[PDB]
Design a protein around this ligand. Structure first.
Ligand code: BCL
Ligand code: BCL
Ligand code: BCL
Ligand SMILES: COC(C)(C)C/C=C/C(C)=C/C=C/C(C)=C/C=C/C(C)=C/C=C/C=C(C)/C=C/C=C(\C)CC/C=C(\C)CCC=C(C)C
Ligand SMILES: COC(C)(C)C/C=C/C(C)=C/C=C/C(C)=C/C=C/C(C)=C/C=C/C=C(C)/C=C/C=C(\C)CC/C=C(\C)CCC=C(C)C
Ligand SMILES: COC(C)(C)C/C=C/C(C)=C/C=C/C(C)=C/C=C/C(C)=C/C=C/C=C(C)/C=C/C=C(\C)CC/C=C(\C)CCC=C(C)C
Ligand SMILES: COC(C)(C)C/C=C/C(C)=C/C=C/C(C)=C/C=C/C(C)=C/C=C/C=C(C)/C=C/C=C(\C)CC/C=C(\C)CCC=C(C)C
Ligand SMILES: COC(C)(C)C/C=C/C(C)=C/C=C/C(C)=C/C=C/C(C)=C/C=C/C=C(C)/C=C/C=C(\C)CC/C=C(\C)CCC=C(C)C
Ligand SMILES: COC(C)(C)C/C=C/C(C)=C/C=C/C(C)=C/C=C/C(C)=C/C=C/C=C(C)/C=C/C=C(\C)CC/C=C(\C)CCC=C(C)C
Ligand SMILES: COC(C)(C)C/C=C/C(C)=C/C=C/C(C)=C/C=C/C(C)=C/C=C/C=C(C)/C=C/C=C(\C)CC/C=C(\C)CCC=C(C)C
Ligand SMILES: COC(C)(C)C/C=C/C(C)=C/C=C/C(C)=C/C=C/C(C)=C/C=C/C=C(C)/C=C/C=C(\C)CC/C=C(\C)CCC=C(C)C
Ligand SMILES: COC(C)(C)C/C=C/C(C)=C/C=C/C(C)=C/C=C/C(C)=C/C=C/C=C(C)/C=C/C=C(\C)CC/C=C(\C)CCC=C(C)C
Ligand SMILES: CCCCCCCCCCCC[N+](C)(C)[O-]
Ligand SMILES: CCCCCCCCCCCC[N+](C)(C)[O-]
Ligand SMILES: CCCCCCCCCCCC[N+](C)(C)[O-]
Ligand SMILES: [Ca+2]
Ligand SMILES: [Ca+2]
Ligand SMILES: [Ca+2]
Ligand SMILES: [Ca+2]
Ligand SMILES: [Ca+2]
Ligand SMILES: [Ca+2]
Ligand SMILES: [Ca+2]
Ligand SMILES: [Ca+2]
Ligand SMILES: [Ca+2]
Lengths: 47, 50, 50, 47, 50, 47, 50, 47, 50, 47, 50, 50, 47, 50, 50, 47, 47, 47
């Protein structure tokens, strides 16, 4: 567990970093999904 | 979700700026593509001037 | 507001210049897009010479 | 709390940095919001 | 599948960002090519404004 | 087998890295294959 | 005025050249935009030759 | 307060640097404001 | 086949990414050239919309 | 023969690296040769 | 004249080449702008030929 | 043949990638020039299509 | 006063560097001012 | 002639290549400008062909 | 011939690649200029085709 | 003759490197010469 | 005077470097002056 | 004379390097001079 890999992180630190990246991606995606529905409603795209 | 070990072999100070920069560039590319290929988006900027 | 741990794994001397530079570039891109696609912003610069 | 992460910061320092970034973003956003209302009022955009 | 020893002599913090960046760029290049060479993809963006 | 190569990895670590790259490629390829069938069905490409 | 702690985490030998370079580039961009979009600034350079 | 931060500066040094940046910005802005009044008076911009 | 000593004096972490990147770029250049100079490849993308 | 050259490799390691590069090139070339025959058959190139 | 402390926090190995390079680039930009936007400077190069 | 001492003062890990990269770029430039200036090479790509 | 700052200079060395930059700028500006008068006299600019 | 102390605070291995490179680039820029803005220089290359 | 002390203060691993690269680029620039401004050089590539 | 120069090579190593570069150049040139004869025969260049 | 400055040179070495730069500039300028007279004589520039 | 300068060379090594550069330049120039005579003879340049 305590092994420090060539990035300088441990396994647990690397998972902690990625979990925040996953969370941020979900926030971005949720906003983007709303923006696409707005774009579909308000622009000529999709009619 | 399963790829978290990427940060054992990629430095986050490299990969996280690259990841976010790529997202930002991608968004600009998409907006620029829509602007350059539709009439309706430049008409939106033009507003009541046309 | 919750992302403050980003500065544990990204160097601020990398990410803060990048963040502000990206904001500056984005603003220029938006202003340039409006200038190139509208008539009203070029007319503003042209002023009474038209 | 003492742990120095690979950026060279502690948790507390990293939060202190980000809080100033949050504050600066709010200032920029407040100014940008005012600029958009001025743009809507003075330019042909939105009529 | 057989090339796993590449990471004995290439640093993953170089090669993994490069690999993924190349994939991302390749995808953009293909999408941009279709957008610039077809009528049907810009017509899709143009939507009902045509 | 404990030899550390000039990348900083051992043989076993290098195979572990590449196996995740292989897995990720298969996921990307599966999604791309679906996207090509959708493109063929919904766009004028291939008729 | 309140942001002086930026120089605790950004190296001034990075950020100060970047800051001043960005200002210089911004000024050139603005002058270039006026030159390319107005007739009056080109006519100023052209002088009595018109 | 003698702490040397990752930039290599102390708090007091960092404030001393920024104060000179603030001063220089005010000089640039004062000159730019004069140049804008000259531009407004001498060019067709704003009439 | 006889040039394997190149990796005594070139770092593989430089030369292997460069070698593969050059191959990738070369392929893109060839595909782009065919796309830009033929009618038949853009017609293939255009499909039934022509 | 255990001499370490300026790349960080021994002679034996450098040959091991290059042999994999040779193998990969042969795979790429085999696929490219097939792709050229497909291109010749399916496209107007060469008639 | 009062800014001499800039060289306490910017390396002259960086800032002095940048400063002089920016001046050189700026001069080229101005000369190129005059060349491209006037007739009289191209005519000066053209001389007696037309 | 007589210049072999160049590798006493140039790093091969610099100069050998540069040398081969320059050769590769040069070849692309020559092929691109022929493609862009002849009719016969784009006709070769166009094949039976026109 | 003998403190060495993060550039590697002392205060006195930094002032000595900047004085030479100030001097050089004055020379450049003097030449540029002459060149502008020549440009005004010999070119159509300003008539 | 009086600026020789520049090499106390600029590394010559930076500044001397930059200085000579800038001179070389400047010369190319001037030659290219004359070539692109005169009839007489391209006519010199064209020779007896036209 | 008298400038050999340049290699006391410029690293040859910098300056020799730069020197040769500049020569190579210069040659390409000259050949490209002739190709783009004469008819006789593209006619030479075109050969019996036209 | 065992002196190590600033590249990290000895005289003998530097000659060994260059001799492989010379050999590779001759191979490339031989192939290029054949390609030029093919180009002259098969293309309109030189008639 | 034997002080080594941040470039790695002494005052005397820095002056020796610059003197060779001055000499080289004079040679370049002399050649350039001749080239301008040739250009004025042989080209339509200046008549 | 055995002093090692900031490039890592001695005076004698730096002269040895430059002499090979001078020789190479003369070879390039001799070839270029021949190529210019060929260009003058075979192309429309100079008639
Ligand atoms: C109208 C729709 C467009 C179009 C739109 C798009 C878009 C948009 C995209 C693609 C993408 C791809 N397209 Mg498509 N595409 C079109 C038509 C084609 C045609 C064709 C002849 O008509 C081909 C060959 C392809 C092929 C491809 C793939 C190369 C690529 C996805 C690869 C992947 O997932 O690998 C995954 C791989 C695997 C799962 C397994 C691989 C196993 C084998 C054995 C490996 C062999 C390796 C080889 C020997 C060596 C490789 C060397 C390296 C290149 C260095 N498309 C049409 C014209 N296509 C995507 C892409 O490139 O993404 C980056 C993409 O984004
Ligand atoms: C229709 C076909 C095209 C065409 C298509 C192509 C294509 C496509 C390519 C070439 C390539 C080459 N072409 Mg051809 N080529 C055409 C017509 C020409 C003409 C001409 C006047 O008509 C010339 C001079 C050339 C010449 C050349 C070579 C310079 C080059 C291969 C060099 C090599 O293998 O060296 C090997 C060298 C040796 C074996 C020995 C050298 C020994 C000598 C003594 C060394 C002297 C060195 C000198 C003094 C100093 C050099 C300094 C360095 C440049 C820094 N071609 C026609 C118009 N040609 C290839 C290329 O550039 O690849 C990178 C290439 O890919
Ligand atoms: C038809 C022919 C073309 C033309 C073709 C070319 C070509 C081609 C070239 C030049 C080159 C040059 N041309 Mg001419 N040139 C033309 C007409 C002009 C006109 C003009 C108003 O008509 C001017 C001012 C110039 C001037 C110049 C020089 C700036 C330059 C050579 C400088 C040199 O050797 O310095 C040597 C300097 C000295 C010996 C002494 C200097 C001493 C002084 C006191 C130093 C003062 C420094 C100052 C205060 C600060 C400088 C700051 C730095 C810029 C950072 N040409 C015509 C239109 N010219 C060459 C060039 O730029 O090469 C790089 C070049 O290759
Ligand atoms: C027609 O073709 C055109 C022209 C349109 C071109 C084609 C373009 C295409 C194909 C575009 C495709 C775009 C795509 C695929 C976009 C994808 C976007 C995604 C997935 C965005 C994700 C965003 C995620 C974000 C913003 C995440 C932020 C995370 C943050 C801020 C957390 C930061 C902190 C850490 C990573 C670690 C903290 C440390 C700890 C110890 C916890
Ligand atoms: C049609 O398409 C077009 C052409 C328009 C292209 C599309 C463009 C698009 C899509 C543009 C989108 C733009 C966006 C998303 C812009 C976002 C802007 C934001 C969020 C700006 C934020 C700015 C924040 C600032 C300026 C913050 C400054 C902070 C400062 C100065 C504090 C500095 C100090 C520290 C960080 C730490 C100090 C240290 C301590 C220890 C306290
Ligand atoms: C007509 O010409 C045009 C214009 C179209 C130009 C031509 C374009 C062409 C020819 C394009 C060709 C494109 C190709 C060949 C695309 C290939 C795409 C592929 C193969 C994509 C693969 C993607 C793979 C991914 C996304 C893998 C992700 C893996 C992840 C996230 C795992 C990360 C973790 C690790 C590597 C190690 C973790 C550590 C451990 C210790 C386990
Ligand atoms: C229509 O769209 C177009 C095309 C026009 C594009 C749009 C362009 C836009 C949107 C442009 C916007 C431009 C802006 C926002 C420009 C802002 C300019 C500013 C704020 C300039 C500030 C300049 C400040 C200067 C020059 C400060 C100099 C400071 C100096 C010299 C002091 C140096 C010393 C130190 C920092 C520390 C010394 C050390 C000590 C220990 C004391
Ligand atoms: C008309 O002109 C146009 C416009 C067309 C421009 C002209 C373009 C031209 C002239 C293009 C020419 C293209 C050429 C010459 C392409 C050549 C392609 C080749 C030779 C490709 C080779 C590919 C090889 C690959 C993909 C090899 C992969 C190897 C791998 C993955 C193994 C990796 C592992 C290691 C190297 C070492 C592992 C470590 C160990 C200890 C065993
Ligand atoms: C219409 O828009 C267009 C297209 C025209 C674009 C717009 C362009 C614009 C807006 C251009 C603006 C240009 C400006 C603002 C130019 C400014 C030029 C300046 C201020 C030039 C200054 C030059 C100074 C020089 C050459 C100084 C040289 C100093 C030397 C050689 C001394 C070197 C030594 C040291 C620094 C230290 C020595 C060490 C010691 C220990 C003493
Ligand atoms: C009209 O103008 C246009 C547009 C055409 C532009 C003009 C273009 C022009 C002027 C192009 C000119 C092109 C030229 C001059 C091309 C020259 C090509 C040459 C000389 C190519 C040489 C290639 C050599 C190769 C591929 C050598 C490979 C060597 C290898 C693989 C060996 C690698 C190993 C080592 C170096 C050392 C191993 C270590 C040991 C200890 C033994
Ligand atoms: C219309 O606008 C256009 C388009 C034309 C653009 C405008 C362009 C403009 C404005 C161009 C202006 C060009 C200028 C200002 C050019 C200036 C040229 C100069 C000053 C050239 C100087 C050349 C000097 C040389 C070649 C010196 C070489 C020195 C050497 C080789 C000595 C090397 C050794 C050492 C430095 C140190 C040795 C070590 C020792 C210990 C002794
Ligand atoms: C109309 O305007 C256009 C468009 C044409 C643009 C204008 C272009 C212009 C103005 C172009 C001007 C071009 C010029 C000035 C070209 C100059 C070319 C020269 C001088 C070339 C010299 C070449 C020299 C070579 C190839 C030397 C090679 C030396 C070698 C291989 C030896 C390598 C070894 C060592 C340096 C050291 C070995 C170590 C030891 C210990 C002995
Ligand atoms: C990477 C960005 C790619 C943008 C590609 C689109 C550029 C404009 C294409 C031509 C204009 C299409 N049109 C006429 C419908 O506007
Ligand atoms: C755009 C002009 C750029 C000029 C070069 C700027 C400095 C490059 C980096 C070398 C100097 C810094 N350092 C620390 C290595 O001495
Ligand atoms: C535009 C030509 C560029 C030539 C390549 C750049 C010069 C070589 C730089 C070498 C840097 C690595 N180094 C100093 C350890 O050798
Ligand atoms: Ca809609
Ligand atoms: Ca409005
Ligand atoms: Ca279809
Ligand atoms: Ca006005
Ligand atoms: Ca066929
Ligand atoms: Ca005048
Ligand atoms: Ca023929
Ligand atoms: Ca004349
Ligand atoms: Ca002739």
């Amino acid at each position: 567990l305590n092994k420090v890999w060539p990035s300088g992180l441990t396994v647990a630190e690397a998972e902690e970093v990625h979990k925040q990246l996953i969370l941020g991606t979900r926030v971005f995606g949720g906003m983007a999904l709303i923006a696409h529905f707005l774009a579909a409603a308000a622009t000529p795209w999709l009619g | 979700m399963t790829n978290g070990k990427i940060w054992l072999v990629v430095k986050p100070t490299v990969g996280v700026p690259l990841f976010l920069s790529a997202a930002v560039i991608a968004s600009v590319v998409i907006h620029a593509a829509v602007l350059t290929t539709t009439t309706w988006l430049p008409a939106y900027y033009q507003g009541s001037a046309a």
